[PDB]
Amino acid sequence: TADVQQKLAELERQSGGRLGVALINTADNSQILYRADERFAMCXTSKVMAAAAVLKKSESEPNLLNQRVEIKKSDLVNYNPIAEKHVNGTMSLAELSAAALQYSDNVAMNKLIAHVGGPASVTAFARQLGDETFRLDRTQPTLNTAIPGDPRDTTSPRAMAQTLRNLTLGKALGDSQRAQLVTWMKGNTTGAASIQAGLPASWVVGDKTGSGGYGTTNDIAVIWPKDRAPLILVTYFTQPQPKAESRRDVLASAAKIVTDG
């Protein structure tokens, strides 16, 4: 409705920044869109595509998820909540995927990127799925710079919603791999103040957050409302000042506006 549009515009203005939203409602195959064709820095939300690329590779390499990866001091980057506990040992690719998706561990992301061949290989996987908007240019930590006007490491809300629908509810991945991705996302620990904070307590959410420079604050989610068909929701937000603080409340507010009713 035009009312949902006016409410999102008012939220954006009060926030001082730039807000991007795409909701897909699978009940009626409808969309609610706000700046949904503009580019936004993905930050952490790009870990979904890296983990999905590893899952796809595993469809023709059984025991790929059990392959061991060495963790060294030289691997540490700027946010390593899980990897810092495993220095000088190994972690499996399954453990790295869970750490990336559920804790936003940046060493884990870098190991998923490296395994599949680098940022251009993650990007080529996106293209294979039919996503011609996503671009992963850099590794962690530099992919989080989020400089206004910079197209590196960006996508649009419309494209990321359509791709997340394919990955979690569609047929991009085999049944075992799709179920594993959904299980990992439902176990996320970083999203309770973002999209989830704008939805009723009874609804079930699998999500991946991101944050970066310029106060960039992001979340992408698959949502099972009580007794309703699933939803896909992307909320991306960025601000004008390099050192702006995070605004997870803006993502919660956007989620409430687009799901009310």
Ligand SMILES: [Cl-]
């Ligand atoms: Cl500043």
